[PDB]
Structure formats: C-alpha cells, structure tokens
Amino acid sequence: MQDCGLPPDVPNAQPALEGRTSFPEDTVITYKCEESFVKIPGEKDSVICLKGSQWSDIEEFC
C-alpha cells in the first residue's frame, strides 16, 4: 500500500514520528542522536518512504 510502517531502528538515535505509526510515500523522517551522542558531520540523519512500502537505508550517524 502507498504507506510505509515504522522506520528502521537506528542505534543511539530516535526518530520523530509526530504521533503516527503509518507514513505515506515520500514521507521524510529525521532522527535525533540520543543523550551523550553527537551526529557525525557529513552523514544522513533521515529516511524517506519509497515505493513498495520500503524505507531508504540509513547507517548509524551518532
């Protein structure tokens, strides 16, 4: 369906979901590093809901 489920689990980061569990195609979700963690400059900190109900890849960035 034209919707993705929960975004991937990134270690030491938490996504901002704004109170929802389902996201429409092209939805961009940004992660914030957890306490005692700082984002690594020049790294992706968000994912996007693409076709097939699949999220784009994201690597640990904290």
CATH numbers and ranges of domains, the chain: 3-55 (2.10.70.10)
Q: Pick the closest to residue 51 from 27, 30, 22, 15 (CA basis).
A: 27
Helices and strands counted in the chain (H then E): 0, 6
State the amino acid at position 13 in one-letter form.
A
Q: Pick the closest to residue 28 from 62, 60, 51, 56 (CA basis).
A: 56
Structure tokens belonging to residue 55: 């999220």
Q: 27-30 — which CB contacts under 8 Å span 24+ positions? A: 29/55
Measured CA to CA in angstroms, residue 52 lies from 8, 16, 28, 32, 39 at distances of: 15, 22, 15, 26, 29
DSSP, collapsed to helix, strand or coil, labels residue 19 as coil
> Dihedral, CA atoms, 28, 8, 6, 12, nearest 10 degrees?
-90
Q: According to the entry, how was the structure determined?
A: cryo-EM
DSSP, collapsed to helix, strand or coil, labels residue 23 as strand
Please tell me what resolution, in angstroms, this structure has. Answer: 14.0
